[PDB]
Amino acid sequence: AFEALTGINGDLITRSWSASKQAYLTERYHKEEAGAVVIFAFQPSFSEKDFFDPDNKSSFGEIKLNRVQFPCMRKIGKGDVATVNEAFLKNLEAIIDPRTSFQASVEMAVRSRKQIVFTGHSSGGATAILATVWYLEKYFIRNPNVYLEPRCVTFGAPLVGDSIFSHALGREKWSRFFVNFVSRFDIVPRIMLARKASVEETLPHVLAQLDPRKSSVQESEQRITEFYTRVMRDTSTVANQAVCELTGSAEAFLETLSSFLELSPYRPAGTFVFSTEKRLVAVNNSDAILQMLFYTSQASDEQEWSLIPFRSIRDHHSYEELVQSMGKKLFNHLDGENSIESTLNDLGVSTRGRQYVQAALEEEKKRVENQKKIIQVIEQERFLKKLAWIEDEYKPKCQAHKNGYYDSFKVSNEENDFKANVKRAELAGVFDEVLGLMKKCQLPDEFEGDIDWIKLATRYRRLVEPLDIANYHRHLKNEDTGPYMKRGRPTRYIYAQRGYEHYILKSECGSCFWAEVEELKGKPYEEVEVRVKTLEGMLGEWITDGEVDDKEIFLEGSTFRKWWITLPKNHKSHSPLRDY
């Protein structure tokens, strides 16, 4: 049951636990070899320099990833790069440097076709998450195979990434590799949900209290109590604000308040396996995980308000007993069992917390329902025949007239042009409807990921975007709001182009040829030399890609050809496409 969902058996769990414990003594990582498995454990650093970087100025020690080193970790359409904790990131690129011999080890490990596992205790777990991301970005995305499928197993790790991080993980379908054990009271999962200033006072004492090696430090009542208190207050505010942002309701009142609040961006990423004295409870829903992080740790009654904080610290060192007593516990996947009220009380969840978790699950179900409805709409016969009528009827008949569809639309002397315009309007309407839902994200993370949503969008773009270019330059909208590329181009086409580019790569646009040739014509050659040259250089690449078709573009009546005639004798003589 457990292994079916998570993809790892108890043997690998125990071996990663032992390797993580071994990694304390080494420097920054320990390499263990068990037959076909190669486990890279990472050394936890319980110093407060290793949770909030000193040179970082933000209130959570977070930084945007470099888009070159972690390209796949971003929103493909919008273009926003993800946010990671800079302490752990600096740790990762410190270990990565060629002098450390980590990279040669992992590459000889992939040459030997071994199951690579990244693991670690509390902060070693965060370093393991980041190293798993780096590995997925450098090796798994180049030549994907099941022989390269990594695994990340963490025990009481803290949150590493923001919402865009978890989204990019869910989109590339990578969030299944990660497993993060969290006992019912461990505090290190919850720490980075609090502000730096909220815990900057009592952080050194508690981090010394959390280090397993040096038990020389002695417990202080008030430091632990106060640290746990604010950690829980910041957690409660972040959780309530995630509840209020569920459906987007009452957002404006929240917006007034949001201007008065700082909230942790970090969000759970991957599968989280809560553990008790009787049960294992796996969750995969980031928002449900976030609500459980607060409501599971709440006190059963006020008399226990004394016992809860101390146990917290103690429970950060219970993973030995956890792994040893793993088989005797009862397991049940929360997201899949349709009756969770008994499980939540068993976990330690009040009534209202149970309802908030229920609401997060219901919102996930509504997201998948919205995906179902969009799939039903885009597959119907009327939409497909609207897309087809432009390829089977408009473009061929406009090729017959030796002018082309883009010109035939521009001059617009037939009923065909009116029908083309109304069809283009309705197509743009449905694509704008779906675009907003994706921008809303009321859609599952895999949507931008799916190839079918990608083929449909790129076909629609290649067919219809020249029509819009013609509509823009036909009614002199150019002379009103500027060049098309800057302010005229719709968002849907940019989303589609970026989705296609990301999918295939893992005047710059293809279907924007007409846009360029518009600004090119009518100017002296001495100033459009370089632009004309770049266009005709890429022209062949689009023709190889398919975006542009020579049939249409090279007809006698076509605007681009009649313009290219006007060019300088020397240019047309030495032009690459002279033979056309």
Beta carbons of 517 and 560 less than 8 angstroms apart: yes
Give the shortest CB-249-to-other proteins separation in angstroms.
5
CA angle (151 as vertex; 149, 156 as ends), nearest 5: 165
Give the β-pairing of 37-42 and 279-283: unpaired
Interface with other proteins (CB under 8 A), residue from 422, 441, 504, 577: 422
Smallest Cα–Cα separation from 536: which of 565, 578, 569, 568? 578
Residue 197 sits in the site that holds other proteins (CB under 8 A): no
Smallest Cα–Cα separation from 489: which of 499, 476, 478? 478
Stretch that binds other proteins, among 50-58, 61-69, 416-424, 525-533 (CB under 8 A): 416-424
Binding mask 259-298 for other proteins (x = CB under 8 A): xxx------------------------------------x
Nearer to other proteins, 147 or 253 (CB): 253
The H-or-E segment that residue 134 falls in is helix 122-135
Residue 66 sits in the site that holds other proteins (CB under 8 A): no
Interface with other proteins (CB under 8 A), residue from 111, 142, 213, 487: 487
Residue 524 sits in the site that holds other proteins (CB under 8 A): no
Give the shortest CB-526-to-other proteins separation in angstroms.
18
CA angle (270 as vertex; 266, 275 as ends), nearest 5: 100
SS (H, E, C) 337-384: CCCCHHHHHHHCCCHHHHHHHHHHHHHHHHHHHHHHHHHHHHCCHHHH
Residue 479 sits in the site that holds other proteins (CB under 8 A): yes
Measured CA to CA, the distance from residue 253 to residue 258 in angstroms comes to 9
Q: Which residues are the active-site residues?
A: 122, 186, 316
Residue 241 sits in the site that holds other proteins (CB under 8 A): yes
Distant-in-sequence contacts of 536-541, Cβ < 8 A, 24+ apart: 536/575, 536/576, 536/577, 537/576, 538/507, 539/513, 539/577, 540/576, 540/577
Interface with other proteins (CB under 8 A), residue from 302, 526, 527, 579: 302
Stretch that binds other proteins, among 116-124, 158-166, 330-338, 473-481 (CB under 8 A): 473-481
Nearer to other proteins, 69 or 240 (CB): 240
Phi and psi dihedrals of 572, rounded to 5?
-60, -30
Give the shortest CB-253-to-other proteins separation in angstroms.
5
Residue 425 sits in the site that holds other proteins (CB under 8 A): yes
Residue 280 β-bridge partners = 275, 331
Residue 257 sits in the site that holds other proteins (CB under 8 A): yes
Interface with other proteins (CB under 8 A), residue from 225, 350, 399, 507: 350
Binding mask 504-523 for other proteins (x = CB under 8 A): ------------------x-
Interface with other proteins (CB under 8 A), residue from 9, 33, 253, 540: 253
Measured CA to CA, the distance from residue 12 to residue 35 in angstroms comes to 12
End-to-end CA distance of the chain: 65
How buried is residue 275: exposed, middle or buried, by Cβ count under 10 Å (0-12/13-18/19+)? buried
CA separation, residue 267 to residues 84, 166, 244, 274, 359 (Å): 10, 7, 16, 16, 18
Residue 441 sits in the site that holds other proteins (CB under 8 A): no
Nearer to other proteins, 368 or 425 (CB): 425
Residue 31 β-bridge partners = 40
Give the shortest CB-118-to-other proteins separation in angstroms.
37
Give the shortest CB-243-to-other proteins separation in angstroms.
4
Q: How many CA atoms lie within 13 A of 96 on its CB side?
A: 16
Interface with other proteins (CB under 8 A), residue from 215, 222, 256, 376: 256
Smallest Cα–Cα separation from 287: which of 299, 305, 269, 304? 269
Interface with other proteins (CB under 8 A), residue from 475, 533, 572, 578: 475
432's CB contacts (< 8 A; 6+ apart) are 490, 491, 492
Smallest Cα–Cα separation from 430: which of 469, 379, 472? 379
Query: How many chain residues are in contact with other proteins, going by CB under 8 A?
Result: 52
Nearer to other proteins, 302 or 527 (CB): 302
Beta carbons of 420 and 390 less than 8 angstroms apart: yes
Residue 356 sits in the site that holds other proteins (CB under 8 A): yes
Give the shortest CB-151-to-other proteins separation in angstroms.
36
Interface with other proteins (CB under 8 A), residue from 33, 392, 426, 508: 426
Interface with other proteins (CB under 8 A), residue from 247, 306, 534, 566: 247
Residues that bind other proteins (CB under 8 A): 233, 236-237, 240-241, 243-244, 246-247, 249-250, 252-257, 259-261, 298-302, 305, 350-352, 355-356, 359, 418, 421-422, 425-426, 428-429, 432-433, 436, 474-476, 479-482, 486-487, 522
